[PDB]
Design a binder for these strands. Structure first.
Lengths: 95, 109, 97, 227, 83, 97, 83, 109, 95, 227
DNA sequence: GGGGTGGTCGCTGTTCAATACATGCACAGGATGTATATATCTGACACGTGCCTGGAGACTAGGGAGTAATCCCCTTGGCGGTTAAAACGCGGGGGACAGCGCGTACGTGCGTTTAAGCGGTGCTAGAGCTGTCTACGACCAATTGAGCGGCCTCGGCACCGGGATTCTCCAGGGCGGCCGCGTATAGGGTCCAGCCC
DNA sequence: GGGCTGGACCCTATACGCGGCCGCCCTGGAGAATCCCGGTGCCGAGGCCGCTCAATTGGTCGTAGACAGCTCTAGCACCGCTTAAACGCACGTACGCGCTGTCCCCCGCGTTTTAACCGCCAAGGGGATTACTCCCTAGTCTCCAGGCACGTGTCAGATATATACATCCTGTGCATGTATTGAACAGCGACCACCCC
């Protein structure tokens, strides 16, 4: 077979099924959403890496991720993403 | 024996892959170490943003009487929102087209 | 006497037409030839993926569309409606090119 | 096909310091897009809970919300003197936003300047302004809500100053018309052909374009009275 | 073999369509040649980086990912072809 | 009658003077008060390094000078010589601001 | 303690000097308020990021490096302040 | 036996520090591994660019009859050169000022 | 006791003494040159890092540095910097 | 104060396959900013070596430059019939660029379009174009070089089209004036008050603003004859 | 009983309302383009299946970061003079802006030409993968010399004072094109001689 | 016997050049700004010294990548056919652009005010450093299930056809402003009854 070329397609599809149970998504919109997820991941991760480097921290924690999110995402988008991330981290910590 | 495996996504209540995000952070040359909560936070943020865009795009598709989201609907969702447009201002959406916008002075008297 | 729309009416019709659609506005085959001709200045005997040429075309059309939006803004600033090379030049200069 | 929002206790009494629960039941699945508002008499409502579980800014942790789908609830743990007010659930999961009937509870920097009272004769037209300040004007929709004692709160429509986009409640097509003015950061509401039922308090309310965001800040309310 | 004058393949009707999508109502006759020049410059800039990425990969095929990387390197991120 | 330069002469002289100089053009103390006032909205009781306020002032003056260059180009495009708020808006909106 | 109206500290002659350095010969009277608004927006954008970096460092003093990082993050790279 | 320490900068004939550049590349989270020639190449490139800018700035200082290079001279050197200005187009130089430039239409007559 | 604040001041000064033996440099101009060196170093290193990541290479070699230089430095700057880097690497290898 | 360039072997003879060495002395330290050019008779000179050691593009490794400071050398290893030409060293370390006196050797796409021969009368003025193509016009200076059969090559000056900046040789101030038109990518040299002394071939040469870059591509030359 | 004048009638100048003409605005209708509804179909999307590798579980080791304590630096606050700059007001010129006219360049549409698009076929270059193996980069330990902090001096530059040059503005004078007024010129009016009625 | 026609002398209507006048261009001079030059002083740049820690050296080891070989995919080349789009041309109109005029509003400048700047002093907050500890992350091994490749079917959207509605554009009719003219009315030329001498 071809080598396993992983992507976010299934996760974006799951999120789509949550937010709009009955709508679908074409392959090109699927690729655009993969590109979007990769780009935002790279932006937040790069910003978090720079924050850690600026502070002489070897590790990227959820606090650097939170600060990177506040720096990159605008307006209310930032605080809703922060709320989502904090909720997820709290739930994960509670196991 | 090992307990039944639970994905960290399930532990965090996420659809996005906390495990894969952690592996990409570790392998992406971002830091020496990656805290346990970092991939969870990042997966939550990515899932939130994906959900926001997909919901606006599905709303646009529904308004267009279409059942499947296409790049046009993604473009409409992004550009009709100031925060998403400023997040993705430097981005081209392939096959996305442009917002219909004619300058008023061009319209006939 | 044959029917004719007044000048600018078909232009606005065509604006609404193309601002609604999403397809590529440049002919794909001559754009591909242009891409290959430009690339041969940098390397001889390059292959191009079909998707590589399509990506270049998407990027070029998007760039030109945004540049014409800025050009139209400059023209309206000059109290004109015809866009002109000075308008393109001003848009490029302010945009930083 | 509008989502009727049903608040179970239409009124209740409680002493100081004990817990209170208010239930709001949705006609259809609204997917957690529910908000709770506290309206002390003759004052604009303040948001308490948004996204059906998240406290609004500045709200003490005494207030809490729960539920998803069609069943939602609001809980007030430590009743204090000022908690006496009318509490409204607002759904914004579908295009016509619908407030709850309101639960009257009785016990033992963003600015949206809005014009004062208006007296008008029937058939006239009136223009409520809503001058907004303390935030980036274009980033948030301005939402308009009509409050009457017979019909409670009714959502009129919104203007999105970023692109002048509008949506209106079908009950207010033609009756209402919303326009924006980026230069003065002001939003105007037209009411055409004023009639007897149009005697109401109209609030402009700020709401982010984010889907989970709610009507967060409110104008003081313009009391239109028609003769 | 060689290609010599393919910029004229970006025809005046095509430039008019791009202008119309850009909201342009009326177009000076010199816009077509100015736009051909501008497009030529943009394509040179993007393709030079794309071919640089291709050379680094020791590839002889310019890939869509090479083009995407070139565009991103010039601050013109393109969604739809990555991956 | 007393000497008086014709309008625009002293303007061009000032242009040459401030393009030759490099000093900051905004008064340091009121700019510092402006910075502290703005920062109060984000975090109370902040402190600023003198070099931090100086960096902010360098950046602000450079940004405003570049914006006025673009504004001047827009005004000249409209065949005016007086820069106007419409020119500032045009320059900013073409820059994507 | 509370500062209230310091945007007016960017005086008309100061804006005129900035315009002169920008090569502006004649200045409309409304340029001053428009420029005060523009500078206000730019400063909020930069200072919000600077304060975000300061809060991340759990510092209470905004440093020149915090300002430099904010600017660089905004595409305004400033040389000369420890960058 | 232990040979006399001979710095990699000297081995490459450079002023810029190959050892420091290598340590910065290793500590900067740029890659898992850093080839031996990479810091030499990067130090040579940085030295070239520094030499070019400093020589142009020193020429500008001489033309001004100043002995010491100042930010004004650095700015003049960079802005008066198209390639340096393109490399540093998005860069502000503190105390650098701007180039003398008045649009012709502003001049008298 | 306060820590060592490393900088490129002495190397910039040695380069200056090569190119213009008699002229000096102010502290502010030296700070600007430090900022320039750090900025260009980070640009080239980041581009080389991304090149290695794109090509699934774990290492940054002089060849990635060369490609990053060609990508970043324009025009004749690119050619002359490539020549300088190649000459230095050749001399280092021969020594 | 102009730097004197001194090519010691004013003429040399050699057969095929043997080695030739040409020296070039400097009156002041020029710090390796020296270039070597090969001019076949009635052809524009082609660059061979730049920055005193680096081969120009397309030049085979037979040519070898060396030296620094004031001592410089050009070496040809495997002579060919093609190598029969005149070789000049050019210093550009100091503001008036100076060519060497030349060395005659006997063996027993960037385009700079330049105008054809122009007959002129004394006292008038002549304007010589240099149409540049194949490259980014504004990024490179256009250097102008005068070639008499008697005084050899003389550098007139350059114009840098990016900012229209110019530098002239003191010998040519007023005599020469350089202008550029970005729209046509053309540089014009205007000579004023023509004299029989001015009868020479004028070359426009592209040179990058990079200090180590030399006059790399040359126009075919414009012969000006003054009656 | 004649000379002469105001009264009154007839002819005509002045003005006013109806006639006629030209211009601007709203509308009805034709033509075209677009939205909408219905049927067909195809190919992409969504789901099911096999498997395999990458993520999870469990444990260990160590060092990165958290926390406490101390120092001292550098930030904030205050105060007093001293101007430099800002604010204000005023007079005026010149630039913005509106309006108008012209002519040409661009839009619209039609008929012709061209080459793009699509399908189908064939081929091979090169991308992608696998396997082997070696050189190269990480890692570690000892050593030391390069680079940083601190101190000091001295000269480059900043500032001040004073001429000298340059640039700006404007008031007066030289020079050129258009208009008023006088003259050599010829066209015609008039005098002398020959001729035909 | 005398006026008509021809030729020549004299009265007068006329085309044309010179002086006066108004506009354009030039220049000298006053004044203000800028630049060059010399003198002074001061503070920051450059050099020197001590130290310490990061770079070098030498050696080991494992794995990342270079290289070889092979496969199979997808990119290139070609061909034919349809038809959609480009092209070229004709025509007209509306828009760009130049010109003119108005007027307001920005500039230049002088005067008053104010608060910025600078120098100095003092307090103390918090940034930076150090020491200690512990817990959180990397690393390892095992194992197993989630996600990826592949296959398949069906339904959502693309297409084709017809129709209904919307929009654009223009010829036609209607309303309004204005030139025209026959006539309603009063002023003056001229005929007549009658007064005055």
């Amino acid at each position: 077979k071809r080598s396993r070329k992983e992507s976010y397609s299934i996760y974006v599809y799951k999120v789509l099924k949550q937010v709009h149970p009955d709508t679908g998504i074409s392959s090109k919109a699927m690729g655009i959403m993969n590109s979007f997820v990769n780009d935002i991941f790279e932006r937040i991760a790069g910003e978090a890496s720079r924050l850690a480097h600026y502070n002489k921290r070897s590790t990227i924690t959820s606090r650097e991720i939170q600060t990177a999110v506040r720096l990159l995402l605008p307006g209310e988008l930032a605080k809703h993403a922060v709320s989502e991330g904090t909720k997820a981290v709290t739930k994960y910590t509670s196991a | 024996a090992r307990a039944k495996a639970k994905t960290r996504s399930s532990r965090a209540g996420l659809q996005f892959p906390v495990g894969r995000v952690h592996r990409l952070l570790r392998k992406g040359n971002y830091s020496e170490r990656v805290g346990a909560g970092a991939p969870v936070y990042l997966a939550a943020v990515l899932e939130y943003l994906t959900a926001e865009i997909l919901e606006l795009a599905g709303n646009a598709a529904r308004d267009n009487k279409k059942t499947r989201i296409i790049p046009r609907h993604l473009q409409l969702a992004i550009r009709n929102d100031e925060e998403l447009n400023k997040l993705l201002g430097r981005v081209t959406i392939a096959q996305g087209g442009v917002l219909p916008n004619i300058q008023a002075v061009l319209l006939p008297k | 006497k044959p029917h004719r729309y007044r000048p600018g009416t078909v232009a606005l019709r065509e604006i609404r037409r193309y601002q609604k659609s999403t397809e590529l506005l440049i002919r794909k085959l001559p754009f591909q030839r242009l891409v290959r001709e430009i690339a041969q200045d940098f390397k001889t005997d390059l292959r191009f993926q079909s998707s590589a040429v399509m990506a270049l075309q998407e990027a070029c059309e998007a760039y030109l569309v945004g540049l014409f939006e800025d050009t139209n803004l400059c023209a309206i600033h000059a109290k004109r409606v015809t866009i002109m090379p000075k308008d393109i030049q001003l848009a490029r200069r302010i945009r930083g090119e | 096909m509008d989502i009727k929002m049903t608040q179970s206790p239409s009124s209740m009494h409680a002493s100081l310091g004990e817990r209170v629960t208010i239930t709001c039941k949705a006609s259809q699945d609204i997917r957690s897009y529910l908000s709770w508002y506290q309206q002390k008499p003759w004052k604009s409502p303040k948001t308490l809970i948004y996204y059906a579980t998240s406290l609004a800014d500045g709200v003490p942790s005494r207030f809490s919300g729960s539920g998803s789908g069609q069943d939602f609830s609001l809980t007030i743990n430590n009743l204090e003197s000022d908690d006496t007010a009318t509490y409204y659930c607002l759904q914004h999961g579908e295009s016509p936003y619908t407030f709850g009937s309101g639960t009257k509870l009785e016990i033992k920097e963003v600015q949206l300047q809005q014009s004062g009272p208006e007296l008008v004769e029937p058939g006239t037209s009136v223009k409520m302004p809503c001058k907004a300040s303390g935030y980036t004007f274009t980033s948030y929709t301005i939402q308009w809500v009509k409050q009457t004692p017979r019909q409670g709160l009714e959502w009129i429509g919104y203007i999105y100053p970023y692109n002048a986009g509008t949506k209106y409640n079908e009950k207010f097509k033609g009756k209402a018309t919303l326009t924006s003015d980026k230069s003065s950061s002001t939003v105007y509401m037209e009411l055409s052909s004023l009639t007897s039922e149009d005697s109401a308090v109209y609030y402009c309310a700020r709401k982010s374009s984010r889907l989970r965001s709610t009507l967060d800040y409110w104008g003081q309310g313009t009391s239109v009275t028609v003769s | 073999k060689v290609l010599r004058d393919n910029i004229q393949g970006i025809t005046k009707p095509a430039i008019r369509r791009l202008a119309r999508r850009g909201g342009v109502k009326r177009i000076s006759g010199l816009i077509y040649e100015e736009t051909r020049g501008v497009l030529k410059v943009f394509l040179e800039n993007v393709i030079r980086d794309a071919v640089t990425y291709t050379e680094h990969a020791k590839r002889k095929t310019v890939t869509a990912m090479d083009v995407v990387y070139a565009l991103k390197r010039q601050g013109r991120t393109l969604y739809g072809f990555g991956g």
